[PDB]
Design a protein around this ligand. Sequence first.
Ligand SMILES: [Mg+2]
Ligand SMILES: [Mg+2]
Ligand SMILES: [Mg+2]
Ligand SMILES: [Mg+2]
Ligand SMILES: [Mg+2]
Ligand SMILES: [Mg+2]
Ligand SMILES: [Mg+2]
Ligand SMILES: [Mg+2]
Ligand SMILES: [Mg+2]
Ligand SMILES: [Mg+2]
Ligand SMILES: [Mg+2]
Ligand SMILES: [Mg+2]
Ligand SMILES: [Mg+2]
Ligand SMILES: [Mg+2]
Ligand SMILES: [Mg+2]
Ligand SMILES: [Mg+2]
Ligand SMILES: [Mg+2]
Ligand SMILES: [Mg+2]
Ligand SMILES: [Mg+2]
Ligand SMILES: [Mg+2]
Ligand SMILES: [Mg+2]
Ligand SMILES: [Mg+2]
Ligand SMILES: [Mg+2]
Ligand SMILES: [Mg+2]
Ligand SMILES: [Mg+2]
Ligand SMILES: [Mg+2]
Ligand SMILES: [Mg+2]
Lengths: 185, 144, 48, 260
Amino acid sequence: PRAPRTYSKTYSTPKRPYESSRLDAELKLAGEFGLKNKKEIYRISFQLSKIRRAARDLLTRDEKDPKRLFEGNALIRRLVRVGVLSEDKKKLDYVLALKVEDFLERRLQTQVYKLGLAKSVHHARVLITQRHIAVGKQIVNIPSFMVRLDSEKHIDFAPTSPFGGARPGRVARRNAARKAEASGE
Amino acid sequence: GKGKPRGLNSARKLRVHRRNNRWAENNYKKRLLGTAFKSSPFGGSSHAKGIVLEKLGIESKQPNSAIRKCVRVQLIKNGKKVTAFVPNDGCLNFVDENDEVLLAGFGRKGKAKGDIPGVRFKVVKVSGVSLLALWKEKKEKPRS
Amino acid sequence: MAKVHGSLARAEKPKKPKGRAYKRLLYTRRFVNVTLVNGKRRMNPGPS
Amino acid sequence: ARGPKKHLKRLAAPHHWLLDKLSGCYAPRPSAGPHKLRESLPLIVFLRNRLKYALNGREVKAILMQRHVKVDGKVRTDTTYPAGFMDVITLDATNENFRLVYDVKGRFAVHRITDEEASYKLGKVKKVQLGKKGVPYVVTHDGRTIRYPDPNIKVNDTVKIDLASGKITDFIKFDAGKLVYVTGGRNLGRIGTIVHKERHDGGFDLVHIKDSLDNTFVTRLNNVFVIGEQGKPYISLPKGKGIKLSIAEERDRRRAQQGL
RNA sequence: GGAUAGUGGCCUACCAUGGUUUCAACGGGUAACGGGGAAUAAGGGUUCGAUUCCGGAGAGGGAGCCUGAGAAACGGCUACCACAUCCAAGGAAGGCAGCAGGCGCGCAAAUUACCCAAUCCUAAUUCAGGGAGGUAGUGACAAUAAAUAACGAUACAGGGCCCAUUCGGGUCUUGUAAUUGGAAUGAGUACAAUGUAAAUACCUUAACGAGGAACAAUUGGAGGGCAAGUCUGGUGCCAGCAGCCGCGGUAAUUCCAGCUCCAAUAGCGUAUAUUAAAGUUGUUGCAGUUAAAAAGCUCGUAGUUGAACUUUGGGCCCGGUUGGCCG
RNA sequence: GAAUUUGGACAAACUUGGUCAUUUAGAGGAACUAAAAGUCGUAACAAGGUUUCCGUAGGUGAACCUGCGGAAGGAUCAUUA
Ligand SMILES: [Mg+2]
Ligand SMILES: [Mg+2]
Ligand SMILES: [Mg+2]
Ligand SMILES: [Mg+2]
Ligand SMILES: [Mg+2]
Ligand SMILES: [Mg+2]
Ligand SMILES: [Mg+2]
Ligand SMILES: [Mg+2]
Ligand SMILES: [Mg+2]
Ligand SMILES: [Mg+2]
Ligand SMILES: [Mg+2]
Ligand SMILES: [Mg+2]
Ligand SMILES: [Mg+2]
Ligand SMILES: [Mg+2]
Ligand SMILES: [Mg+2]
Ligand SMILES: [Mg+2]
Ligand SMILES: [Mg+2]
Ligand SMILES: [Mg+2]
Ligand SMILES: [Mg+2]
Ligand SMILES: [Mg+2]
Ligand SMILES: [Mg+2]
Ligand SMILES: [Mg+2]
Ligand SMILES: [Mg+2]
Ligand SMILES: [Mg+2]
Ligand SMILES: [Mg+2]
Ligand SMILES: [Mg+2]
Ligand SMILES: [Mg+2]
């Protein structure tokens, strides 16, 4: 006797397991963006899919019907806040045409490398999970943050971080102590 | 007219016909006759402990002669004798007699022209140790 | 086989990187540094 | 089971209390009283969930035990007292007066009330009848029995009641073209004028109602509750005035009250 | 009429001779509690639902009853049946399908822990009580998130980009080298504080905390299906060999061991069940000359199915909701 | 107003046979198996049958013939009108 804590899966494993084409596509996709599981890809494929379903289910209904209007506009403006859907494509028929990379391109991981705070994408990984990289007043340490558009123009280093400001890290002051003590001697 | 009633007030004939016709499916018949609870040696469970009755040197000829190092095991819950494969083991230094053995399913179809039969079970555990771990020299076997 | 009691954590050839890193390795094992052998993409060859 | 139940599980509580579903495992089963279980609000809910005046349950008992909280002029000290529709609630230490009337969205709403409106109360007349020694009386929805009413008052009529003496000030008849709050059902929380009453014998009467935006709907007579006259209500309606808007309209109205 | 809080064959007398049934009664089965719901499918479906909410039923099996508004109550009583305990042998007590815990059973499931602080309930009642409930322990049931490394220089090594007339002018990307260099960080440890009924932890944070030749990642595979060996030795007395089909023996990509590589990765294999695949259950949607399958043939009741036709056509007016050309 | 007693409805349970249905421990007997071993029978012996079927009847025998009625699921040349 509680309420039963609801919960759900997030991804979905491919239907054909060994398919030299899908295999590769996936690998290059992990490569552009430095993902670690294929699972990271699947998660995207899956959200995408739920959106394509909502999309169609709206599409089959009459234009100027309250529901298609309401949920349509919502789905649209939601897709826009994260800048997955461009400003000009603001009509359902494009949200179908959406593909995976359009989602993979809004990760904090990605935007860190495309706002040039990192040297390579992998660098951006490390830098994120290292508690270095803030979005405004918040630190964020998940590579999958999914940057909204109005939060693009705030991403910087953490006021906590060595690069952001503050004091040097543990290694730095370790070597500072080593050289200072070795010279005092 | 494709030989089935197609009328709007015809449901009963349709669904009844379907029920009488589902008895040609195999699994359906197994599932409503409780064949699993009445006959199947496992009693409708994914596994069964048994005690090795006798070490069997069956010989299954065509097209490939298996010097079948298999076992007669008797399941504890049914007192029901069964034959079972003991995989990956060349010498059978792992499985002796009077040994408790956890069995699972195993899908070897038997063949006709060489009188090779289909055992349906593989040893998964002996004396509480996993056949695999023994075979990997990962875990050792308590011998009693 | 037998790792002795000293599994108490608190108080050979090069290794392969794990996780993300490993994938990176593969991405360059197959696409940045392509190895075209005999008109095909050969994976795991000995002497040829 | 065997006797009356004394608990109420969390999920099984009437939804419009808006109890969160991880706070506990139970929910304040309303005591026996003036209103139906399903459609009443236990004071603890009104006090801790809707006024935020107390954080726990015992804080609420603490409050109630200083004779602070009045309901219909009188002091109740039962955490699970069932104050339902149109009841007056008094918090003297804050000098506030509340009325339990339905929000547009079918739930109970906080509503501040002047001292001059707190004095009285409306009551749907659920049944008039003749009692002992031939004395005629009404029984009004909050359970109140009133003696010697005016003979013009039959069923479904509303009655104004001085909370002080418990006597009948005046009343209102159930005729076409009156103002009406709809209490039970889906359209619960709406307000409008009664177009015409549909009469089905041995069954449930319906009522067609047309609101101030000249839109129409239908409910059983069971949920129709008379307020007053065309734009001349006897009680003060909340904001919203019992006018229900499509989700589009509400989306727009909300996004149009944002200019910082 | 009796009984019941009350209708009522509920029961009792007395009358009738009815009531159900191929639109499947009655009986038998269910390894059946019912529903809200769950899994899976484009759809249509198929299959689950002991289990967090609702309703019902039971407290070892039967039956009976006190008290009371409410019980045919079992953390009430009485008896019989099954078990079983203490005895000084006279007697006396017993129901964990409440929480923990034990035995047994099995393929199969945790602590004889802390507390009324939340949630709510009971009482004469703000205070008392609550294994209801909450908190921690165990636990790879599951579900979410996501560390196991990021750089640089160097050289060797190469390719490419423009000046090649040749040195060199630099951009870039790589292969390396158990090469170097200095950055980073939480796994872990720990003052404090926060948290908390009290703690544990999380989140915070002094202080420590890796070149990581080991803060060392696995589980399955590499003939085909099916992603991956044109690699060495051994075999070939423990040897063509075990989901299915393949394939040989001095020289084997097909077996065994190592090396390599592939797939999914804090997880992966295997067994049973079930859904898809399965248009191999077919209403949507199968097939029936020869592959499985048109009754030997007609008649015929239930059942399913059933030709056409009975105010069309014209005239008037009213006011709505999208769309244009103007704003 | 207790022990006790009359008769009821409710009705657990007991005894008895009879009956199916099982769990059993025993005994009676029969039949099947070979990673058992050797022995003869024909292995280590030689061929022959080959339109094929259907229903039915009989005969048997170690098998297979055979009567009656069906079927092609059996290989249309030649001449001519
Ligand atoms: Mg109960
Ligand atoms: Mg209703
Ligand atoms: Mg059952
Ligand atoms: Mg389908
Ligand atoms: Mg259920
Ligand atoms: Mg059960
Ligand atoms: Mg229940
Ligand atoms: Mg009961
Ligand atoms: Mg029991
Ligand atoms: Mg009582
Ligand atoms: Mg009882
Ligand atoms: Mg008990
Ligand atoms: Mg009880
Ligand atoms: Mg228990
Ligand atoms: Mg208490
Ligand atoms: Mg509990
Ligand atoms: Mg788990
Ligand atoms: Mg403290
Ligand atoms: Mg391996
Ligand atoms: Mg293979
Ligand atoms: Mg394969
Ligand atoms: Mg291949
Ligand atoms: Mg077919
Ligand atoms: Mg045939
Ligand atoms: Mg045929
Ligand atoms: Mg025929
Ligand atoms: Mg017709």
